[PDB]
Structure 1
Amino acid sequence: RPRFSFSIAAREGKARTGTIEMKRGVIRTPAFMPVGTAATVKALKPETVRATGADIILGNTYHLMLRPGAERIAKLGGLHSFMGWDRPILTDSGGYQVMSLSTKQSEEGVTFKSMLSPERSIEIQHLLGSDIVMAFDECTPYPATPSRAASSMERSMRWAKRSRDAFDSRKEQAENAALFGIQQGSVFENLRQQSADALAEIGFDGYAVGGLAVGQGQDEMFRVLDFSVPMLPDDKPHYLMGVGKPDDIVGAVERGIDMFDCVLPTRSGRNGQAFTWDGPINIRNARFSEDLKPLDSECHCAVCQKWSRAYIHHLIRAGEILGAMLMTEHNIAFYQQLMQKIRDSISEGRFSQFAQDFRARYFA
């Protein structure tokens, strides 16, 4: 199988749909990656994650390097075997969570309490047996001074080269996995340009848009995507990290994004929030106490085929694990169905109408 082969099947405006072929499977783009925090997509067996339509999941370097530990997972056969997901896994580099969850920053890297460097990040992702390795970056806090944004980005660009070289010098990794670079630059077009320039110069299999969804509202996120995604190599996937709500996803695909990860469907699922085509609902609301309809009237997921709002309402209010299970399965299924609808509509050259139709109904 191919290491990493991205093919664009169809375009509409800035939107693209296609496939990333990897050794462990095909990723249909635009893709949503369920996040699997500590070697589990919370409340779901991998077979259920797969059943919802996920082609790839996200693993966290930061969390796994602490618990159970990267050497330990490698000893146990790698993350795929450990958690029983045999399809592609993208691992974040730790760059974001080390600052958000732990800290002393330096040129060599970051030292913390719960040294993570580009090299060590790559190595850990190696030990995990990640299929898509993220370069180790610094997710510039928002907002930030232009000079601040610029030296922050420039360090990440230096760390991107280091990541590239560390990755390349590990033959197994280089032959079997992919490496993505992460664009930073905050909300600054010139810094974003600079960063894309550096990344493209170094060369990556894919390019993420880092440092968004970190304080910027949707309007501002979209404005930054409007100029930032065109700076990335067209012929490589574009990954918007940590985004987002269904409408964030639709608008980002309209701006050229091919890949997404977000904790929202899993986390808000556990918290009672179900996504529906008519917008989110909070299943704990007393209005659902005797509602026999499924979470979503159109959803094809197993939850919606079998259980009512009323039942899931009861479960979540009772703090029952099955409630978290069913809410999560539905929300991830919903997200996957959204992605499918997105892919099909771009394929068919009716994505613009879809986005419009989606938005009308979702916000109504």
Structure 2
Amino acid sequence: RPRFSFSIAAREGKARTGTIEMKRGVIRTPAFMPVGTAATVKALKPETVRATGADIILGNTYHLMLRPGAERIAKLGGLHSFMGWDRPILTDSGGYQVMSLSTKQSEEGVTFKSHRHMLSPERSIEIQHLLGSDIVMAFDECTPYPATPSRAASSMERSMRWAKRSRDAFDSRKEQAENAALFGIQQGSVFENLRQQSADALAEIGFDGYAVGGLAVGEGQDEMFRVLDFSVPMLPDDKPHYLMGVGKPDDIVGAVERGIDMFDCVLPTRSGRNGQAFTWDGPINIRNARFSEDLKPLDSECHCAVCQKWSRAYIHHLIRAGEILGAMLMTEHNIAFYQQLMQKIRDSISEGRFSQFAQDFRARYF
């Protein structure tokens, strides 16, 4: 396969379905990327992650640079070898968790004290290289919501300067430039003019893919959809569109209807461990006493291994008992559910019936 090749096979309205070919494998879009925090998709072996249908996973950088360390992982052979996942891995720049998990910001980057460290566009790119990331994210500054036009502009402008620095750092490292891909991140809060300026700056620089950043920060789905309506069309049409940190099932369907090709979210994994299981009839909290003697599987249609073998009653017991198998089962089901959702989305778009699928999905889910 090539270093990077995004091909759109079918479209319906603003929605698209296709593939991203990379050296480590093919990614079917729209795609959902399970999040691996600390070199592991919580409670799941890599083979299980793959079994659910995942083509690519997201690797948390901020966490890895602290422990076990970027240099160490490189010494041990890279993240893929380290955790046992040989397919594509997208790594975030760490420019988000730093300003939320641990700090002094400047035009040069961000220094912080782990929950004494410096992180700049150059170091972020280097860390992603050391990890062996397939899709590298430019180092940006996620703008807090709400944000005044002035602060949003300043932040967006700095992110664009950092986007240029990320680009050059990436290109200056031959091994990385030839084997990995680089995505730029659009900022600008909820303001149309800032989103346009950001989109133009990113396109001027040139990237393999474009992410829509700064959303899913507490603005509400209505507002998020409104911003996506005018923001996604600003990005290059022939490159992947990645909505960072968005994962609620209904959020995903609506985002795809607006042109998004890639997603990532900790919801399926985090919620799974918390007792929330996704079903086509909406999410359910398995801890609820009503499930103590329910012999049905988590979801009546789900084809995952958990729904083929265990009942809601058993998982209910496991979770309330605090058993590790509870987290394992809930997580496998949730991630499988998300992948099945992406497959249904891909299929409906390919068949020109996505709009109908979107409406049917909402009617039953809500």
Q: Into which bin does the TM-score normalised by the smaller protein fall?
A: over 0.9
Instruction: Give the drift of 1:132.
Output: 0.2
Per-residue CA distance 1:135-163 (angstroms, 9 max, x = gap)? 00000000011010000000000000000
Separation in structure 2 between the aligned mates of residue 215 and residue 139 of structure 1, nearest angstrom:
13
Separation in structure 1 between the aligned mates of residue 191 and residue 105 of structure 2, nearest angstrom:
22
Per-residue CA distance 1:250-292 (angstroms, 9 max, x = gap)? 0000000000000000000000000000000000000000000
Per-residue CA distance 1:26-77 (angstroms, 9 max, x = gap)? 0000000000010000000000000000000000110000000000000000
Instruction: Give the drift of 1:100.
Output: 1.1
Separation in structure 2 between the aligned mates of residue 35 and residue 233 of structure 1, nearest angstrom:
26
Three-state SS of the structure 1 residue aligned to 2:144 is: coil
Q: For residues 272-351 of structure 1, what are the structure 2 equivalents within 5 Å?
A: 272-351=275-354
Instruction: Give the drift of 1:125.
Output: 0.1
Separation in structure 1 between the aligned mates of residue 137 and residue 54 of structure 2, nearest angstrom:
19
Separation in structure 1 between the aligned mates of residue 270 and residue 3 of structure 2, nearest angstrom:
32
Residue segments in structure 2 that go unaligned for 5+ positions in a row: none
Per-residue CA distance 1:74-122 (angstroms, 9 max, x = gap)? 0000000000000000000001111011111100001111110000000
Q: 1:94 and 2:94 equivalent? A: yes
Separation in structure 2 between the aligned mates of residue 191 and residue 94 of structure 1, nearest angstrom:
23
Q: 1:141 and 2:148 equivalent? A: no
Q: For residues 182-261 of structure 1, what are the structure 2 equivalents within 5 Å?
A: 182-261=185-264
Three-state SS of the structure 2 residue aligned to 1:207 is: strand
Per-residue CA distance 1:267-318 (angstroms, 9 max, x = gap)? 0000000000000000000000000000000000000000000000000000
Moved beyond 2 Å, runs of 4+? none
Instruction: Give the drift of 1:189.
Output: 0.4
Three-state SS of the structure 2 residue aligned to 1:198 is: helix
RMSD over aligned Cα atoms? 0.4
Percentage of identical aligned residues = 100
Three-state SS of the structure 2 residue aligned to 1:143 is: coil
Separation in structure 1 between the aligned mates of residue 61 and residue 313 of structure 2, nearest angstrom:
38
Q: For residues 125-136 of structure 1, what are the structure 2 equivalents within 5 Å?
A: 125-136=128-139
Instruction: Give the drift of 1:128.
Output: 0.1
Three-state SS of the structure 2 residue aligned to 1:53 is: coil
Three-state SS of the structure 2 residue aligned to 1:214 is: coil
Instruction: Give the drift of 1:244.
Output: 1.6
Separation in structure 2 between the aligned mates of residue 275 and residue 170 of structure 1, nearest angstrom:
42
Per-residue CA distance 1:190-230 (angstroms, 9 max, x = gap)? 00000000000000000000010001100000000000000
Per-residue CA distance 1:333-358 (angstroms, 9 max, x = gap)? 00000000000000000000000000
Aligned residues: 363
Separation in structure 2 between the aligned mates of residue 339 and residue 163 of structure 1, nearest angstrom:
31
Separation in structure 1 between the aligned mates of residue 346 and residue 48 of structure 2, nearest angstrom:
21
Q: 1:163 and 2:175 equivalent? A: no
Instruction: Give the drift of 1:238.
Output: 0.2
Separation in structure 1 between the aligned mates of residue 285 and residue 61 of structure 2, nearest angstrom:
32
Separation in structure 2 between the aligned mates of residue 215 and residue 138 of structure 1, nearest angstrom:
16
Separation in structure 1 between the aligned mates of residue 173 and residue 310 of structure 2, nearest angstrom:
49
